[model samples]
Target: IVNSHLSELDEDVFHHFGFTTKSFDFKEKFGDVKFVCVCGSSGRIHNFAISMAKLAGLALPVENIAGSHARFVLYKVDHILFADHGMGIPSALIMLHEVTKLLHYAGCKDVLFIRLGTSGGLGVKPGTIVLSDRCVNTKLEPYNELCILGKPVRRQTIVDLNTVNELKKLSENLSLECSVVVGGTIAANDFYEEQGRLDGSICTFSKEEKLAFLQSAYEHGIRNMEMEGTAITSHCYLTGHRAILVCVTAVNRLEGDQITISTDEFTLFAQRPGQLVGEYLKRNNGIIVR
Candidate 1:
């Protein structure tokens, strides 16, 4: 196996047979979970994911799974693989494969990826949150063939239309401080520098060029730039499943200004998203079965 318990955790050597690490299966743990939330980011997104986990009351057992780079959240309704370490495509693909396997094993009915991080909003300014309608891989050399592996290229619509609408309703009800833009997102392996690395790195372009790049991104309708989303979106789309990325702008990527969001703020943002799901399930006749 490319990844098989490279190390141990909690005094026990975790096992891995293609993401089958723990003895307890995911499906078995999916006692009442009906939805899955996925969030990714180096800092901002990471905070959002954790916050949402707590707000949704999905934070159960927090542990380190064997042979992986992220922590695990054991929830009654769902099991979350909180990937803290941002990984490239190779490791990323493997992790997704493994997580999906575990989710199937855990009996997850639906999955939603909520991205809790910051974005380079171009001219959109800071504090704006972006809800991606689609994710684009501009770094791919042969950009046209990015989806050769499987699934529809430009695959969108993760949260079923109803869910999206419900999320919108929640936003309206809460009067969220960010705008809900249905646009494209750019995901790269090295967003920090190589994709135009920041903080005094080698670059073939000038400051004007960098501005052009950001402008071009917005011109083409990209909401922001991040390291994940596309891979996650692509995986779920290819597999005929569900996934979504909800991002909050913490700082302007163009500038060096850094910002912070409180734990309660994130908890509140995530609460409504899950609340809508709960409400949707309930309206459609939901039952909390033990």
Candidate 2:
């Protein structure tokens, strides 16, 4: 069970977690936490943690709490817990499972979950920031499909649009250079065909076929392509958690498949979403302990 309560067991060990229920002081370490930020890359999350440290009054940058053995990372800055979920849905789901349990053990309530990433822009401009209204699958459906004991299960992938709107309004106040788009985020199983990209090892579909699917996705309000939104939305939805998916558009897929951007441009675009979060914290005074 993904949402298992540890009370049923003597002491549960979070498999991917470096610390267990009996090992660490969850109340002391994460008791004040209010925001959980997760990203696709470890470095992205690490950078985000560093960026948020000063705002949260953390003097020195924190260390990775996930430990050396874990595939993911865990870092905290006052009230925000940051981590990486790798590149795909399975990896993200694994991290969420353990992290959710950790928060549960900590007796954390009213915690906001934020999933950040860089995605291929569907029809928007490159480097545009996206606040997902919902997450749709490769089948163009807002459902996360899972195979449980050879039985197919579909969970609705709904994000907190109110939170999305709140952040979007906050971004407008910031008046940043990047365009903030509010739309559906398409979550694909693979990086290539699942996203209708022709630049793969094997692509049997014609350009017409690829464009048709992408057009359909655009018409459905899907604006960006990424790997984890559907999984995160579905899990958090089922778990009854308020979650938001923020993605920066790396390249406009309607123009090309490869992310053709200069290093400097990518760096600037990468910082925008996190900076928006920083501003939001300041505006609401939520940067500190609440």
Candidate 3:
């Protein structure tokens, strides 16, 4: 079983995540957690949690125990915990560190981490879900770079190969119209400028340059671009945990910058990944929802 890494240190409260070991019994509350799924927003995560509950046939009662001021929204059902990690890499890294520690302290075992969110597709059509085989940087490097002690350090953004294959099989079996494919993902630092978007407040580069960059990324096998892919994959890699990223493409960057799809259709697109992952978990855990 997974156990805490802390050794005789002073216990500090997790402020941003809005819970402490003192206020909540980590072992009692999360001891059986087997899966942790995070998304970019509270509404999406909350909906995914409810969807998972229905699929798992769990009659879970969810409430905001951390109150309205909490930076994170959390929901627990059976052996799964669904959470919102907010938008960018910084926000995601913070949440990942705290939650991993939460699971460790809670003595959980054999946990799987999954990220379900939206991204801008590269060559694919809108609403296509991409299961990230590996996460790449803005330069198409399969690693995440961080500055440590005034020096740059790189970490491999590797996902478990077994998990990738299993999810790909599940994707193939999915009955949804939106196609699913496994490919590389580019983790950009910004939604507009870094992602080569022309619609930002500042457009230093020409549209020609943007297209060239997108073309280069596509040629390098990058199927989608998102904000938190590197952080999630790299963190899981370093921690010896199994993780995978499933993001639905909201728009094809090659086509346009705007998400012109109707809200109803986009909403349906968003739920496809959640449904796929939920079904996989239900089957794996022997929880039939028929």
Q: Of the candidates numbered 1 and 3, which has the greater TM-score value?
A: 3
- Over 4 Å off, model 3: 1-5, 65-67, 286-290
Model 3, 126-175: lDDT tens digits are: 98989998898899888878898999998888876688788888877767
lDDT of 1: 0.49
Root-mean-square deviation of candidate 1: 7.1
Deviating ranges (above 4 Å) for candidate 2: 1-5
Instruction: Give one digit per residue, the lDDT tens place, for model 2 in 111-150.
Output: 7789878899988999899999989888878898899999
Q: What is the TM-score of each candidate against the true structure?
A: 0.65, 0.94, 0.93
Candidate no. 1 TM-score: 0.65
User: Residues 50-122, candidate 1, lDDT per residue (tens digit)?
Assistant: 4544544554643333334434322222234444324444444554665555555555546654444445554
The candidate, 1 or 2, that scores higher on lDDT is: 2
Residue 277 miss distance in model 1 (angstroms) = 9.2
